[PDB]
Structure 1
Amino acid sequence: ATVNQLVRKPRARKVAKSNVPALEACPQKRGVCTRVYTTTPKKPNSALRKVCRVRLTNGFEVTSYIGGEGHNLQEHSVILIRGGRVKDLPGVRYHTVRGALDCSGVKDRKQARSKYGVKRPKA
């Protein structure tokens, strides 16, 4: 607290790491699905959450959530991941991008389509 003390040894700024380290300051990264599976979330939530273990462009091996109802994904499927952690799922730090690369858009969506890669219903 003393000014002399500060002069002697200055205040150390809080070194904050990123919660999305495999992205490496990139908005998105491309990767290959090592395996696609479902997992049970932690309490108090009950589901079978769709998720994929991805071998990334930059050598990292992560797991990424698959948003939306139904997906075309399987092994050796080239996908784009975007970051964003799933609170329920243990170790999941990434979202797959719906409507980019091998990943298809969600079927029969009419709202929030941007998030789910769904094209305009032409009428």
Structure 2
Amino acid sequence: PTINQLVRKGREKVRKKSKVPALKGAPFRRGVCTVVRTVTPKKPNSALRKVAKVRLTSGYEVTAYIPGEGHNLQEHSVVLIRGGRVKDLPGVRYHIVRGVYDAAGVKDRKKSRSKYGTKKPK
């Protein structure tokens, strides 16, 4: 545009839409599981991925992924959640943090234990 148009209108600063609205500004949000079930993934992947619908303290109900091999989550399980989608489960925007509240860590895990919330084994 001309310089006069810029004096008249300016340049538009565009805001960044959060990909984690349910957290409401927080790094984590506590919640309660409602549905604990498996969901199948989008093409071209095939699986039975473990998900929980979580009713949050931020006033939201959201689906969150349960990472690692095996879990112990059921209806009324109290979980903590963090940001992070599953490229491949549309709608899943968050992850349950293993080793917090009622989420058990992964049993027998050895590599990458801080994720998956597993204590060092003797």
TM-score (norm 2): 0.98
Distance 1:80 1:3 in 2: 52
Residues 16-69 of structure 1 show CA distances to partners (whole Å, capped at 9, x for unaligned) of: 210110001111100000110100000000000000111101110110000000
What percentage of residue pairs aligned between the two structures are identical?
Answer: 73
In structure 2, runs of 5+ residues without a counterpart are none
Unpaired segments ≥5 residues, structure 1? none
User: Which portions of structure 1, spanning 4 or more consecutive aligned residues, are displaced by more than 4 angstroms?
Assistant: none
Task: Name the residue aligned to 1:84.
Answer: 84
CA RMSD of aligned residues (A): 0.7
| Aligned counterparts of 1:55 and 1:116: Cα–Cα separation in 2 | 22
Other structure's SS at 1:68 match: coil
Partner residue of 2:112? 112
Q: Take 1:44 and 1:57, find their aligned partners in 2: how far apart are those partners?
A: 35
1:47-100 superposed Cα distances (whole Å, 9 cap, x missing partner): 000001111011101100000000000001110001101110010000000011
Higher alpha-carbon deviation: 40-49 or 11-20: 11-20
Say which SS state the counterpart of residue 4 (structure 2) adopts.
helix
Instruction: Show the counterpart of 1:35.
Output: 35
CA drift of 1:9 comes to: 0.6
Q: Distance in 2 between matches of 1:61 and 1:110?
A: 33
Q: Following TM superposition, by how much is the alpha carbon of 1:13 offset from its aligned partner in structure 2, in angstroms?
A: 1.0
Q: 2:63 maps to what in 1?
A: 63
Aligned length: 122
CA distance in 2, matches of 1:29, 1:35: 17
State the distance in 1 between where 2:28 and 2:63 align: 14
| Amino acid corresponding to residue 111 of structure 2 in structure 1 | Q
